[PDB]
Design a protein around this ligand. Structure first.
Ligand SMILES: N[C@@H](CCC(=O)N[C@@H](CSCc1ccc([N+](=O)[O-])cc1)C(=O)NCC(=O)O)C(=O)O
Ligand code: NA
Ligand code: NA
Ligand code: NA
Length: 222
């Protein structure tokens, strides 16, 4: 039957996103590393997997996929356990709530948090480009407003879609993980329900496993 293949280094946020869901359902998989220093993601071979020249790409037999959230939902459906139901697709209103807060991550939370990761981590280390502190300052003020909403939401439920962990919650892991390595990692402590939610996510065996393969400078970067 052959395990599925993920193309891209495990440290890349959107690769890690897929690996988390693979681990949640206990599926075998192969991580195919790629050399960004020779721009392997822009090679003719990889463009045939992801025509926009990005990672992850994904292969299951003759099926090629890209876009991390699409890959992840395919994994969750293919390996649907019964022991794990992260999409709630058998329940219309639960699936809707999972969908809402998955979209919130994609279009409200991650656009506020991701720039801080880029400016404080990716740009200086990976690209040799210094931190633009005005982008950081503007993004932090937006993130704080987002976190005020999350704090209220997570005061009523343990997770974002209700009293169950879901696709919505776990999609928050890869970029927030790296945020915890920036100078702004203490931010969450001002939002106690958000911090507790985050710690529940970090306690998950699948999350523990993948975060160990991403390895920051050292865990919660000081
Ligand atoms: N929507 C897509 C986004 C995928 C994506 O952005 N992949 C990035 C790597 S993860 C995000 C990321 C970007 C940059 C760094 N960095 O260190 O400079 C780290 C992580 C990529 O391949 N970029 C190459 C390109 O677009 O040309 C998905 O979720 O799959
Ligand atoms: Na990019
Ligand atoms: Na599911
Ligand atoms: Na918004």
């Amino acid at each position: 039957m052959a395990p599925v293949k993920v193309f891209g280094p495990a440290m890349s946020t959107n690769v890690a996103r897929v690996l988390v869901f693979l681990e949640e359902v206990g599926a075998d998989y192969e991580v195919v590393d790629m050399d960004f220093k020779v721009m392997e993601h822009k090679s003719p071979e990889h463009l045939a997997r992801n025509p926009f020249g990005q990672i992850p790409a994904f292969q299951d037999g003759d099926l090629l996929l890209f876009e991390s959230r699409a890959i992840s939902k395919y994994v969750l459906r293919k390996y649907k356990t019964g022991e794990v139901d992260l999409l709630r697709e058998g329940n219309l209103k639960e699936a809707a709530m999972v969908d809402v807060w998955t979209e919130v991550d994609a279009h409200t939370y991650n656009p506020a948090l991701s720039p801080i990761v880029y400016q404080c981590l990716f740009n200086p280390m990976m690209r040799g480009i210094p931190t633009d502190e005005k982008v950081v300052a503007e993004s932090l003020e937006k993130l704080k407003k987002v976190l005020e909403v999350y704090e209220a939401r997570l005061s009523q439920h343990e997770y974002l879609a209700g009293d169950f962990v879901s696709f919505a919650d776990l999609n928050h892991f890869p970029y927030t993980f790296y945020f915890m390595a920036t100078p702004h990692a203490a931010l969450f402590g001002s939002y106690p329900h958000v911090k507790a939610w985050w710690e529940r996510i970090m306690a998950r065996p699948a999350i523990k496993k993948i975060s160990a393969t991403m390895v920051p400078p050292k865990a919660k970067g000081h």
